[PDB]
Amino acid sequence: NYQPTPEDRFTFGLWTVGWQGRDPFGDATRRALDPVESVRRLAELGAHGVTFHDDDLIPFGSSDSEREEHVKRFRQALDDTGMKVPMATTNLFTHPVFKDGGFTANDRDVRRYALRKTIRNIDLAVELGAETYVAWGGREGAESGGAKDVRDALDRMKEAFDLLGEYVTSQGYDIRFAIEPKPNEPRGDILLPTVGHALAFIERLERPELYGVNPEVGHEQMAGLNFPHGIAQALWAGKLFHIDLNGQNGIKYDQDLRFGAGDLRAAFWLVDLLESAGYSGPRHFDFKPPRTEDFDGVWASAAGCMRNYLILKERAAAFRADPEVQEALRASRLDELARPTAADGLQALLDDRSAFEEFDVDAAAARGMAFERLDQLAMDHLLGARG
Ligand SMILES: O=C[C@H](O)[C@@H](O)[C@H](O)[C@H](O)CO
Ligand SMILES: [Co+2]
């Protein structure tokens, strides 16, 4: 049961199944993967498409000649399988030139180089059919308080994204940008550390309609925040352009576990939210098969990502469709939350004596919210103990 088909819109980064397992304390445990091979292996598992960094597909320092050979064979693999490329991004973190950042490096010449490297890959992304261009500023930040004037850094960050929007606008490209937040690692503190900081920042850009967020389960969980709550606020603002799905076990290093691992109940409430809201973008997996695994374990880990989404989707549909759950939701007054507080208006509210002078505060205090019975019904459905 629970088999993925291209209609489920599951996508994967080339850097995910392709991670060789080199972490801070150890050397790589797997051989490098050919991107053509990843495309074919992922198509056979039922994936909708792939994503990439420029440096995943074209090795850094490649001439214009070698570049076109790498793009050509990749394209052939896409043409042959029907795999899509819905999203692409730039590597502005691996090479030592970016050790203090790309867009917010203190050195001005590095910031201009960062912009040129990005613009080049946007042209390629659009050619391949990508609709979202992701920016993760993993090197934008500091280890010490005096190294970075954060107000000046935000001016430089705003300058770079405005320039990018002017570029896609002048070229007539039908592509949008999505900022991916992370609170720390590899820098001591990273700029725009959460979904909220990223949403606020977009509103100061010159063309705010071109920019949204690409939140990641584990990144918000590295700050101890409620990921479904943060997704709700991004949807409320009309800014959920893309999403990165994986797992994370609490506040620690970025684990990038397969989706469904880590905080399982949060994964259930996330899937409930994405499906009931009708999110229609890619279900992208940004995970790392643990370096304990050989290549058989890499493909099993990837399949597990899609399988866990499909199970949770089924459990959330059953939860919502259960008449007993619908009764529970009315008993907890979820339906009154959808009602305006004072659609009668400010003057009516001020003259309404039942809202203050004659409000029976003790009777309203004594009402039970009945939240625990509702939560146990959610638990029963998740576990298939009444589904
Ligand atoms: O290893 C890859 C990054 O750490 C990942 O978090 C970003 O999603 C990627 O750069 C795409 O922007
Ligand atoms: Co991560």
Ligand SMILES: [Mg+2]
């Ligand atoms: Mg990510």
